[PDB]
Structures are given as structure tokens and as C-alpha cells.
Design a protein around this nucleic acid. Structure first.
Ligand SMILES: [Mg+2]
Ligand SMILES: [Mg+2]
Ligand SMILES: [Mg+2]
Ligand SMILES: [Mg+2]
Ligand SMILES: [Mg+2]
Ligand SMILES: [Mg+2]
Ligand SMILES: [Mg+2]
Ligand SMILES: [Mg+2]
Ligand SMILES: [Mg+2]
Ligand SMILES: [Mg+2]
Ligand SMILES: [Mg+2]
Ligand SMILES: [Mg+2]
Ligand SMILES: [Mg+2]
Ligand SMILES: [Mg+2]
Ligand SMILES: [Mg+2]
Ligand SMILES: [Mg+2]
Ligand SMILES: [Mg+2]
Ligand SMILES: [Mg+2]
Ligand SMILES: [Mg+2]
Ligand SMILES: [Mg+2]
Ligand SMILES: [Mg+2]
Ligand SMILES: [Mg+2]
Ligand SMILES: [Mg+2]
Ligand SMILES: [Mg+2]
Ligand SMILES: [Mg+2]
Ligand SMILES: [Mg+2]
Ligand SMILES: [Mg+2]
Ligand SMILES: [Mg+2]
Ligand SMILES: [Mg+2]
Ligand SMILES: [Mg+2]
Ligand SMILES: [Mg+2]
Ligand SMILES: [Mg+2]
Ligand SMILES: [Mg+2]
Ligand SMILES: [Mg+2]
Ligand SMILES: [Mg+2]
Ligand SMILES: [Mg+2]
Ligand SMILES: [Mg+2]
Ligand SMILES: [Mg+2]
Ligand SMILES: [Mg+2]
Ligand SMILES: [Mg+2]
Ligand SMILES: [Mg+2]
Ligand SMILES: [Mg+2]
Ligand SMILES: [Mg+2]
Ligand SMILES: [Mg+2]
Ligand SMILES: [Mg+2]
Ligand SMILES: [Mg+2]
Ligand SMILES: [Mg+2]
Ligand SMILES: [Mg+2]
Ligand SMILES: [Mg+2]
Ligand SMILES: [Mg+2]
Ligand SMILES: [Mg+2]
Ligand SMILES: [Mg+2]
Ligand SMILES: [Mg+2]
Ligand SMILES: [Mg+2]
Ligand SMILES: [Mg+2]
Ligand SMILES: [Mg+2]
Ligand SMILES: [Mg+2]
Ligand SMILES: [Mg+2]
Ligand SMILES: [Mg+2]
Ligand SMILES: [Mg+2]
Ligand SMILES: [Mg+2]
Ligand SMILES: [Mg+2]
Ligand SMILES: [Mg+2]
Ligand SMILES: [Mg+2]
Ligand SMILES: [Mg+2]
Ligand SMILES: [Mg+2]
Ligand SMILES: [Mg+2]
Ligand SMILES: [Mg+2]
Ligand SMILES: [Mg+2]
Ligand SMILES: [Mg+2]
Ligand SMILES: [Mg+2]
Ligand SMILES: [Mg+2]
Ligand SMILES: [Mg+2]
Ligand SMILES: [Mg+2]
Ligand SMILES: [Mg+2]
Ligand SMILES: [Mg+2]
Ligand SMILES: [Mg+2]
Ligand SMILES: [Mg+2]
Ligand SMILES: [Mg+2]
Ligand SMILES: [Mg+2]
Ligand SMILES: [Mg+2]
Ligand SMILES: [Mg+2]
Ligand SMILES: [Mg+2]
Ligand SMILES: [Mg+2]
Ligand SMILES: [Mg+2]
Ligand SMILES: [Mg+2]
Ligand SMILES: [Mg+2]
Ligand SMILES: [Mg+2]
Ligand SMILES: [Mg+2]
Ligand SMILES: [Mg+2]
Ligand SMILES: [Mg+2]
Lengths: 275, 68, 114, 88, 100
RNA sequence: UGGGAGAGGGUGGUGGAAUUCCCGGAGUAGCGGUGAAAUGCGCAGAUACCGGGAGGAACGCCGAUGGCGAAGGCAGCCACCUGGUCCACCCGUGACGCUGAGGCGCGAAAGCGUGGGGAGCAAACCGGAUUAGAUACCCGGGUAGUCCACGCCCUAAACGAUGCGCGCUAGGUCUCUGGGUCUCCUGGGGGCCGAAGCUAACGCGUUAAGCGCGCCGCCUGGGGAGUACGGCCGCAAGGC
């Protein structure tokens, strides 16, 4: 669910917040957190290289496990489900019988107290991890590796999920959350289910301040600038674009494709995203 | 030429009796009407329901091409 | 070159098309009301279909066709005549089966079909 | 559904006398049983409205009888809706 | 607890060892889902009316069973979990209806 | 207590036929559509044909003059959860009944909100024809919507244009579903023709519009008008 407010201030009228129903532990596992080096959007030159960033709430980075083939055959109990400020999804605390504790992204349906496991033999049940080739075609899956032993790269955002469409040789065919049809390697691990917190997108920030909390500084339109600043800049009074609409750096921004043509991974993408 | 006559005591509810049932289908695969099967009102429903069950089980066709 | 093969008849209210294939199902040649030389409404006529199946048989015989199996689809007014033309053509007609696609209440039809 | 045994356990617990069936007490208790079963079914199946009618009819029925018993025997009424946990 | 009639269709082109393997998962599954087997009829192969998974043949199994009511559906789901298992049809058991 | 019939309702699964798109093979000069045409599609390889894949939607034969529900309405198949109802036995309760101003719920289609989905179909819209014109009827396209979830709307030729319950007043025939002894008898539904009687007539006639009792709703010339004002409901459209 999402939680609405009564309109006792102009902003609380439209503001909505997460329900936090699935959360069972409001404290991070101390040995799994490290400080998050905030950037402000600036690179090693001190130069802003992504605009309009900074001033967000301080965060502690949780160390998440995106390999999971790291501990094949050793089951684990789901001790708690926690809030993670560095992602849209929720995270699950895993207490391995091994005695090791690691975080995974919390799938939808994952119950606190239940047990999960990784490996070619794993039961096809929510929260288990297997190479793609050992997962039944048609079952939905998340946290998918793109290449073997390189870590979960696909379907990690709240509510996302990939789906297996069929097999072809060493590779299997996934339909990524964007709808793109892609061949991913059979040995790539993935975790069955969809990501939890699917309600994430129905949140209405509600006021200028909330975006500021999220480290999102105000964004300024090209049209509201000057000819030095932006292609859309200047003009007496208000003004339309007067040219094909562009980024501050000059390139066209309505329709213009940007994926590199001669990219080697083209051979593995079957159907570019719908819509 | 009513099919109900040309058979002995048989179970309508029996969906695995492919040999009995196949007599109740037309040459084109369609379930035969009462005017051809000789079943009463009540019997027809039991027959129809089990014929459909069998079709799912691969024992009976959903359709067959019309030869001349 | 193939001796035995298939004879497909797509005959609708507006036209009749005939295609001769190999036993694997690969077309060898085809004809229709347009191929014989007619246009407009005249394509749907029985006489059009007669010429169609023939030109479909004639070209077929020229590639070694001897035996055919006639598969029929469509309920056109030129249908049965197409069948006539294939028999009297010099082809074997080892069988004739109607295989018109009929849904089990699938997609909603256009307005003119309700 | 409600199992034959459970029905009897209820039938027996509210019988005025060992041979008793269909009396006010038995009637109400049986109704109360179907009601609380249905009440649960409809809590999950919020969209099953055709059955809600039955629920209402039952609820209507149980109500009419309790009014009868209360009219005839106040002690026996106030003891029944207490031993079933009803009035509210 | 109620009486049902589990039908199962398996890949005909398996060997007997593979064939047995599937049966092993099956027979344990029934046990795990409270299904106590009664009668049983393994009619082996059979010619199908239409291809199933692009295959003219189908290997038939059949089990009269007694399991809890509320557990039948999940069993059916677990039964279909195999790639060689191609059809699972559980049916409420019913006394025959006789004609003539 | 014991038994039955059924597209009654809800959730989860699941099967094949067909349409569309996509990939491959093979193949060539048109295909499509109509009263006849044209727009359109096609040598940049279409149609027609075979193989594969993807996706949505509706369930052909059975199917009925049939069944079920209070109405709206409900149809492949399976399972679970669940309502109503009929029969037989004649065991239990002892008038506990009927109706029902308000209230409450349910309420086809279209329509609205948020998020999915989107094959076919298709308001709006574009084009081709027809035509005096054609903001239409026909043809080629086509977006909402049609589908799912949750929440709104609450209208109708929501009709049997026939409120509910009950008693009494010839029968003949077709049908569905129970119980007997099964020739047939006896219940409960679905039609038809009809005694008596009703009715302005048409027609109704044990499924009354017959003869009677009870309760509710409603009518009081046509238009103005289901409009106005007020009030209540709705996000709005709008409803009462
Ligand atoms: Mg939630
Ligand atoms: Mg709010
Ligand atoms: Mg508040
Ligand atoms: Mg509130
Ligand atoms: Mg305020
Ligand atoms: Mg305000
Ligand atoms: Mg959140
Ligand atoms: Mg938050
Ligand atoms: Mg909250
Ligand atoms: Mg939450
Ligand atoms: Mg802290
Ligand atoms: Mg530390
Ligand atoms: Mg330390
Ligand atoms: Mg860091
Ligand atoms: Mg950092
Ligand atoms: Mg540095
Ligand atoms: Mg420097
Ligand atoms: Mg420096
Ligand atoms: Mg940038
Ligand atoms: Mg910045
Ligand atoms: Mg989080
Ligand atoms: Mg948003
Ligand atoms: Mg949004
Ligand atoms: Mg922040
Ligand atoms: Mg922004
Ligand atoms: Mg701005
Ligand atoms: Mg300025
Ligand atoms: Mg400057
Ligand atoms: Mg300059
Ligand atoms: Mg410039
Ligand atoms: Mg400018
Ligand atoms: Mg300016
Ligand atoms: Mg200036
Ligand atoms: Mg200007
Ligand atoms: Mg300016
Ligand atoms: Mg100026
Ligand atoms: Mg100006
Ligand atoms: Mg300006
Ligand atoms: Mg301005
Ligand atoms: Mg300008
Ligand atoms: Mg300009
Ligand atoms: Mg790559
Ligand atoms: Mg049987
Ligand atoms: Mg034509
Ligand atoms: Mg009752
Ligand atoms: Mg009371
Ligand atoms: Mg399977
Ligand atoms: Mg009973
Ligand atoms: Mg092609
Ligand atoms: Mg094909
Ligand atoms: Mg019909
Ligand atoms: Mg008695
Ligand atoms: Mg007495
Ligand atoms: Mg009443
Ligand atoms: Mg009222
Ligand atoms: Mg409605
Ligand atoms: Mg609607
Ligand atoms: Mg809308
Ligand atoms: Mg909508
Ligand atoms: Mg809007
Ligand atoms: Mg939408
Ligand atoms: Mg569309
Ligand atoms: Mg026009
Ligand atoms: Mg014109
Ligand atoms: Mg004009
Ligand atoms: Mg049109
Ligand atoms: Mg169209
Ligand atoms: Mg619109
Ligand atoms: Mg809209
Ligand atoms: Mg609109
Ligand atoms: Mg109606
Ligand atoms: Mg009507
Ligand atoms: Mg009626
Ligand atoms: Mg009216
Ligand atoms: Mg009137
Ligand atoms: Mg009334
Ligand atoms: Mg009988
Ligand atoms: Mg009758
Ligand atoms: Mg009459
Ligand atoms: Mg008279
Ligand atoms: Mg009178
Ligand atoms: Mg007269
Ligand atoms: Mg009569
Ligand atoms: Mg009646
Ligand atoms: Mg009158
Ligand atoms: Mg007047
Ligand atoms: Mg007046
Ligand atoms: Mg009004
Ligand atoms: Mg109105
Ligand atoms: Mg007003
Ligand atoms: Mg009204």
C-alpha cells in the first residue's frame, strides 16, 4: 500500500509515503555497512559531470550480495527485511546455517523466517538462485547476471522482473523489464521471483523539499537561460524552441538514437524495447 | 443408426474409454447431436462433459479434416 | 521435379487462388483469377476459378507433376468448379479434403460478419 | 463445507433434550454456524456478492428467531446469544 | 480427505531409467501432499489424437488416490514442474453412470 | 435425516481452434475489396503454401422451444471456497407468519480515477467511393475503449412494458428435473392450446390479466419537462 495524508498543509495534500509494512528491522547489520562517499555529482577533477545533485540525507551503504553462486548448496534463513536508502527495492538479511550473514534484494513474497538457497539443484521457489539454464522457461526471475560470475546486473529496481522466453544453445532468452528481447548466458545466475516494493512508483513526492532530501537539486530549463548557457536560451519575452530541441551540449533530444552502432553486444540483443 | 443402441452397458462418466467414445464423434470430429446419439437429456451432458475431458488428455480430437 | 504433391485452393467470395506444392509443402507454382487475366468482380466467378486451377495444373505438369492431393479452403462460389478443373486437367487427384479454418469463437469479426 | 460430525456436535450441544432438533436453540446455533463460515468466505472473496444475499437471508433468519425466543423466554434468549456470542 | 483420479502424461521418448526417475518424484510428491494411493493403472504409451509438445505419442499414468481437499491444487502445480511432465489432470472421483 | 439437478457466485490453474505480428523455407504478378470501383497493399518479393516463435481475446460441435439466479445476468476444461433450490422420509420446533415508508446491499452497456495489458474489433478521426451535397449508409486505415486489478458511476425497451405472499376455480399436449409400483401415478420448474370467468378490444386463462384477503409502490389530459429553482449524491459526465 501507499500512505496518504490529510491536507493540513498545502503539500501534505498530495504527498504520499511508503507503507513500510514489509519492514521488520529498522537497524542495519553493522558488519555489512560502510560509509557512502557522497559525490555531489563531481568527478576526480572536482568538475560537475552530472548536474543538479547534492544536499541529500546522509547515507550508509549496505553491502549487498549480487553473486550468490558464491555459496552454492548452503541454505540460509530470512532473518529480517530492511529499508535500504541506496535503492528502490527492499533488502533481506540472510542468516546462513554457515553462520555467514549477507544482504540480498528482497523479492516480492519473501517471508521472514523462510529458507532459501543457491545452486543448480535449488528448488524453483521464491528467493532461490540458480544458473539460468536450470530454471524452467516461463518462470519470472530477477537480479540477473549479464555475464557468468560478473554479478547481478539486470532487474534490480523495485517491482522489476525478467522472464525466460526460451532457450537457444548455451544461451537463454530473457525479456528484460524494458521489453527488450536479449540472449543471456545459461551459466548466468538469477533469483526466482519479481523484486518487491512494487508500489514504489505510486509515490507522490508532494513538495519541493522532498526532492531535496533525495539529493536532487533544482533542474533548470534551457528555455529559461541565455544563448551562452543553452541552445534554447534567450529570446525576447517567452519563446518556443526555434530549432530541433537540444541538450545544453548541442545534441538533439527528441528521438535521436544514441546506442553505439558497431557495438559487439548487438549480436545478442534480439528485439529492442517496445513503446 | 443411433449409437446408444449399437453398444452394451457403458459408462458415460468414463473419460478413458477411448474406443466407446470415438463412436460418438462425427467423421469431422464434432460431438454428435441427440438425434444421432439416442441419449436422453440428462445423459447427453455427462457424455459431452467427459468427451471434452478426453480431448484434453489427447485421446480425442478437437477437430478432424473432412475427406471426400 | 516432383510426381506426387499437393493442390491448395484458397477460394473466397471475391477470388479463387490455386497453389501447387510438393509433398513437403513447398509451392511449385500458383495461379488465380488475376493470373488468367480477369479483374474486378469477374475474379470470383466459377469460370475464373476453372481457368485458375488449370493454369495451376498446366505449369505443374511442366515440372513433372502427376499426382496431387487437393486441399480445399474457403466457401466461395467458384470452389467446386476449381475441383472440377483439376480432375479433368490430367492430374491424378489421389484425394480431396476440405480444410477451411473455423474458429472456436476466437476473435470478434468485422461489422459485416455479425 | 461443514462436516456432518461438527454439525452433530453443535446439534447435540444446543438440543433442549436428547432427541431435540429443529427447536429455537438448535435452529439458531446451526444458522450461527453457517453465518460465521460464510462471513469468513466473504472476507476473502469480497467479490462474491451472490452468496452475500444468502448471508443476509441467514442473518435475517437468525434474527427473526432470536426475536421469537426473546418474546417467549427472556432467560433462554439472553443465555443463547451469550453462549453463542451474538448481540452487537 | 477426498477421492480424486490423477492423470499424468510424460515424454514418450525417454528411456526406462529416466522414465523411472520422473515416477520417483511423482510417487514422493503424492506422499508429501498427503495423497495415499489406492488403485493404479500405468497404460504406458498411447497414440495421441493431436501432437503434444510436437510429439504424436504420450506415456500415460493414472492413480486413484485419497488426499486432503485443500492440498490437491498445489500438488497439481508441483506435478507440472517437470519438463517431461506434459499434462496433469486431477479429477474428483465419481461413481460410473451406466447406459442402456 | 437422506438424496438430486444446474452456463448460480468467487479464487487459482489450464486445453485446443482461429486472427494478428515476427523468424525460416519455397514460390511469382498480383492481392484485396465492391452493386460496380477506388483508396490500400505488392518485383524493396506481396497474396496463396509449409515449419517455427510471440501475444491478447473469445470459447466452435455438445446447444435445446434447455438449465441456473431476486434482478442485472451466467457457457471450453479442472480443482478449491460458496449461495440459492427441488424431491423423499413425515423425525424435531409450536404461528416463530406475510408485506414493507425510511435504511442497507446488489445492479447490463457506455462512462470516470490509478496502475497493468493490448491479437482482433472499433466511437472520434483520415482516406477511397456513392451523391446535387454525404460532416452518413459501402470500402482501406484508425485512437480511446473493449480485457485484468482496485475504487467510482447507479442509468435503460433494468420488459412478462404484468409488485410480493396466500387460498379457491375443467382439462388437452410438448419439455426439464426429482420420488413411487415407472402401464402410469405424484411433486417442482419451462412453453403451447384451451373450461369457467375476465377484458375497450387485442388477448389472459392453476406461470390469470379468473374469483378473493393482506401490505407496499404508482396513476389523475397533451406539451412545457424529467426542464427550472431548492436540496442530497458524484472526480466529472451526471443521477435522484
Ligand atoms: Mg504492500
Ligand atoms: Mg496524500
Ligand atoms: Mg495524515
Ligand atoms: Mg486520509
Ligand atoms: Mg491548508
Ligand atoms: Mg493548498
Ligand atoms: Mg520506498
Ligand atoms: Mg522512502
Ligand atoms: Mg507509512
Ligand atoms: Mg514497504
Ligand atoms: Mg541508526
Ligand atoms: Mg565498521
Ligand atoms: Mg569493526
Ligand atoms: Mg561507498
Ligand atoms: Mg560512493
Ligand atoms: Mg581524490
Ligand atoms: Mg585541479
Ligand atoms: Mg586537483
Ligand atoms: Mg550530465
Ligand atoms: Mg550537482
Ligand atoms: Mg528500500
Ligand atoms: Mg511517479
Ligand atoms: Mg505516474
Ligand atoms: Mg539521499
Ligand atoms: Mg526531476
Ligand atoms: Mg525547471
Ligand atoms: Mg531569461
Ligand atoms: Mg560563461
Ligand atoms: Mg559564443
Ligand atoms: Mg548556442
Ligand atoms: Mg531560442
Ligand atoms: Mg527567453
Ligand atoms: Mg536578457
Ligand atoms: Mg523569440
Ligand atoms: Mg528572455
Ligand atoms: Mg521587448
Ligand atoms: Mg513574443
Ligand atoms: Mg524567455
Ligand atoms: Mg517563463
Ligand atoms: Mg523563438
Ligand atoms: Mg522555427
Ligand atoms: Mg554483452
Ligand atoms: Mg469413471
Ligand atoms: Mg475480387
Ligand atoms: Mg436459511
Ligand atoms: Mg436482536
Ligand atoms: Mg511442464
Ligand atoms: Mg442436505
Ligand atoms: Mg516470408
Ligand atoms: Mg503457418
Ligand atoms: Mg448454439
Ligand atoms: Mg411429526
Ligand atoms: Mg409439542
Ligand atoms: Mg421481505
Ligand atoms: Mg426500501
Ligand atoms: Mg453498472
Ligand atoms: Mg463496463
Ligand atoms: Mg476513463
Ligand atoms: Mg479505464
Ligand atoms: Mg486523466
Ligand atoms: Mg490506460
Ligand atoms: Mg492496439
Ligand atoms: Mg470520409
Ligand atoms: Mg466526395
Ligand atoms: Mg459543401
Ligand atoms: Mg470501416
Ligand atoms: Mg480494420
Ligand atoms: Mg480520447
Ligand atoms: Mg483516457
Ligand atoms: Mg473522455
Ligand atoms: Mg435486460
Ligand atoms: Mg426478453
Ligand atoms: Mg420472470
Ligand atoms: Mg418502467
Ligand atoms: Mg405507457
Ligand atoms: Mg413491492
Ligand atoms: Mg423417476
Ligand atoms: Mg407445470
Ligand atoms: Mg393461451
Ligand atoms: Mg368463453
Ligand atoms: Mg376486474
Ligand atoms: Mg373484435
Ligand atoms: Mg395446465
Ligand atoms: Mg412459476
Ligand atoms: Mg386490465
Ligand atoms: Mg395543463
Ligand atoms: Mg400537463
Ligand atoms: Mg435533472
Ligand atoms: Mg435522466
Ligand atoms: Mg439544481
Ligand atoms: Mg427512476
Amino acid at each position: 500500500a501507499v500512505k496518504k495524508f490529510k491536507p493540513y498543509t498545502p503539500s501534505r495534500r498530495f504527498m504520499t509515503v511508503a507503507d513500510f509494512s514489509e519492514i521488520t528491522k529498522t537497524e542495519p547489520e553493522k558488519s555489512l555497512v560502510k560509509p557512502l562517499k557522497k559525490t555531489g555529482g563531481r568527478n576526480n577533477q572536482g568538475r560537475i559531470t552530472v548536474r543538479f545533485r547534492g544536499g541529500g540525507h546522509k547515507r550508509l551503504y549496505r553491502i549487498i550480495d549480487f553473486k550468490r553462486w558464491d555459496k552454492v548448496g548452503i541454505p540460509a534463513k530470512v532473518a529480517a527485511i530492511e529499508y535500504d536508502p541506496n535503492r528502490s527495492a527492499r533488502i533481506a538479511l540472510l542468516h546462513y546455517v554457515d553462520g555467514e550473514k549477507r544482504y540480498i534484494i528482497a523479492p516480492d513474497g519473501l517471508q521472514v523466517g523462510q529458507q532459501v538457497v543457491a545452486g543448480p539443484d535449488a528448488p524453483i521457489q521464491v528467493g532461490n538462485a540458480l544458473p539460468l539454464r536450470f530454471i524452467p522457461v516461463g518462470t519470472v526471475v530477477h537480479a540477473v547476471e549479464l555475464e557468468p560470475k560478473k554479478g547481478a546486473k539486470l532487474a534490480r529496481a523495485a517491482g522489476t522482473s525478467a522472464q525466460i522466453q526460451g532457450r537457444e544453445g548455451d544461451y537463454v532468452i530473457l525479456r528484460l523489464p524494458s521489453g527488450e528481447l536479449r540472449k543471456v548466458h545459461g551459466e548466468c545466475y538469477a533469483t526466482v521471483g519479481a523484486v518487491g516494493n512494487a508500489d514504489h512508483k505510486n509515490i507522490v513526492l508532494g513538495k519541493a523539499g522532498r526532492s531535496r532530501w533525495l539529493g536532487r537539486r533544482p533542474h533548470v530549463r534551457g528555455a529559461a537561460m541565455n544563448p551562452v548557457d543553452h541552445p534554447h536560451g534567450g529570446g525576447e519575452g517567452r519563446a518556443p524552441r526555434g530549432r530541433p530541441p537540444a541538450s545544453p551540449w548541442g545534441w538533439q533530444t527528441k528521438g535521436l538514437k544514441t546506442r553505439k552502432r558497431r557495438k559487439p553486444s548487438s549480436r545478442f540483443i534480439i528485439a529492442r524495447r517496445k513503446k | 443408426a443411433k449409437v446408444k443402441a449399437t453398444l452394451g452397458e457403458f459408462d458415460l462418466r468414463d473419460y478413458r474409454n477411448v474406443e466407446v467414445l470415438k463412436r460418438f464423434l462425427s467423421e469431422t470430429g464434432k460431438i454428435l447431436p441427440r438425434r444421432r446419439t439416442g441419449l436422453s437429456a440428462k445423459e447427453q451432458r455427462i457424455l459431452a462433459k467427459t468427451i471434452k475431458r478426453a480431448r484434453i488428455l489427447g485421446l480425442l480430437p478437437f477437430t478432424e479434416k473432412l475427406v471426400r | 521435379q516432383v510426381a506426387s504433391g499437393r493442390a491448395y485452393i484458397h477460394a473466397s467470395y471475391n477470388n479463387t487462388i490455386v497453389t501447387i506444392t510438393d509433398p513437403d509443402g513447398n509451392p511449385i507454382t500458383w495461379s488465380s483469377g488475376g493470373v488468367i487475366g480477369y479483374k474486378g468482380s469477374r475474379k470470383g466467378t466459377p469460370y475464373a476459378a476453372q481457368l485458375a486451377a488449370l493454369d495451376a495444373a498446366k505449369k505443374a505438369m511442366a515440372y513433372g507433376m502427376q499426382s496431387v492431393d487437393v486441399i480445399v479452403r474457403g466457401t466461395g462460389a467458384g470452389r467446386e468448379q476449381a475441383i472440377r478443373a483439376l480432375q479433368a486437367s490430367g492430374l491424378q487427384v489421389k484425394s480431396i479434403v476440405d480444410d477451411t479454418p473455423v474458429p472456436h469463437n476466437g476473435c470478434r469479426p468485422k461489422k459485416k460478419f455479425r | 463445507p461443514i462436516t456432518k460430525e461438527e454439525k452433530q456436535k453443535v446439534i447435540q450441544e444446543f438440543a433442549r433434550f436428547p432427541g431435540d432438533t429443529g427447536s429455537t436453540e438448535v435452529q439458531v446455533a446451526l444458522l450461527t454456524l453457517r453465518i460465521n463460515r460464510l462471513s469468513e468466505h466473504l472476507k476473502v472473496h469480497k467479490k462474491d456478492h451472490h452468496s452475500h444475499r444468502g448471508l443476509l437471508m441467514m442473518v435475517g433468519q437468525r434474527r427473526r428467531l432470536l426475536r421469537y425466543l426473546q418474546r417467549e423466554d427472556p432467560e433462554r434468549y439472553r443465555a443463547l446469544i451469550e453462549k453463542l456470542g451474538i448481540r452487537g | 480427505m477426498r477421492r480424486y483420479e490423477v492423470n499424468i502424461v510424460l515424454n514418450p521418448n525417454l528411456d526406462q531409467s529416466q522414465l523411472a526417475l520422473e515416477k520417483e518424484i511423482i510417487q514422493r510428491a503424492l506422499e508429501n501432499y498427503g495423497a495415499r494411493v489406492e488403485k493404479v493403472e500405468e497404460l504406458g504409451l498411447r497414440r495421441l489424437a493431436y501432437p503434444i509438445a510436437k510429439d504424436p505419442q504420450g506415456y500415460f499414468l493414472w492413480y486413484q488416490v485419497e488426499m486432503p481437499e485443500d492440498r490437491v491444487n498445489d500438488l497439481a502445480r508441483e506435478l507440472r514442474i517437470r519438463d517431461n511432465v506434459r499434462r496433469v489432470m486431477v479429477v474428483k472421483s465419481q461413481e460410473p453412470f451406466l447406459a442402456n
